[PDB]
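agent: user wants the structure for apo-carboxypeptidase a=alpha= (cox) from Bos taurus. delegating to structure tool.
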Amino acid sequence: ARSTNTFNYATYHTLDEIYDFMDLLVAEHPQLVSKLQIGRSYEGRPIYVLKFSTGGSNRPAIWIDLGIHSREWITQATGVWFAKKFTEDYGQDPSFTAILDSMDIFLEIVTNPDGFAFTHSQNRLWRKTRSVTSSSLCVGVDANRNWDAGFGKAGASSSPCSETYHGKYANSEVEVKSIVDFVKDHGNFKAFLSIHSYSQLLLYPYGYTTQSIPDKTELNQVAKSAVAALKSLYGTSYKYGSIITTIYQASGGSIDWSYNQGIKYSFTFELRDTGRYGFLLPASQIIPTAQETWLGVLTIMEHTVNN
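agent: tool returned. relaying tokens verbatim.
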């Protein structure tokens, strides 16, 4: 509340609390972190990214997004913990220090603010954005099906009332298009990570086509290693593989888009648990979840800095 050291990380927060947290963090570490507004949501809420940097101009960067699906509260909660962690570990953790000294990290805690607000205000289990239209009384698009990657292919719904509705056209949702333009304009992203929940999976592309990516052996080995690191803390077991072989066909996904943009290290994490609580994971699981995912992510960043 008054300081990031006083913020309660072991609990779930509303949108305004998370946005206040960002300003506080910026205030305390003006030299490391900045807040950028890359757009406004459908209902007009600002869309913010925190930039963590030790300088340089256009350094190679790491993108991380959380909360694209609003009801996955463990993701926004993990995001706020990561933001604090970066500031704590810079200069104490040799590894993470080496990463920040040469690369920038861009963190989008609440990718879908309108749906997050709605999860607190009206329906805890809403997952889509809140865009509306004409030929339907139904609202919203599944933002992870709106990217320009096999857009409209099998693995998405064409019905507006579906929970997996892909939208009118690729990039129709402003929350997605804001990310697209920002990443394209930067052009120096080397890693793209999207965090969702639940199922305990670490996936790589693709989900829209059975075709194998050419970087399959390396991605798989990085995935393996990351999973091994994650499990190391609490023994949480993840499986890993390409989206389509692992889950099922799904089109218009984030990481398929990023990888096709030339961003090699593109992975999606599906956090705890495996179904016992599902979207409604207990607040007592926030910290342990965050701590173990951090080891997973750090592992991918380390490989990135190195390759």
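agent: one observation worth passing along. The two ends are 40 Å apart (CA to CA).
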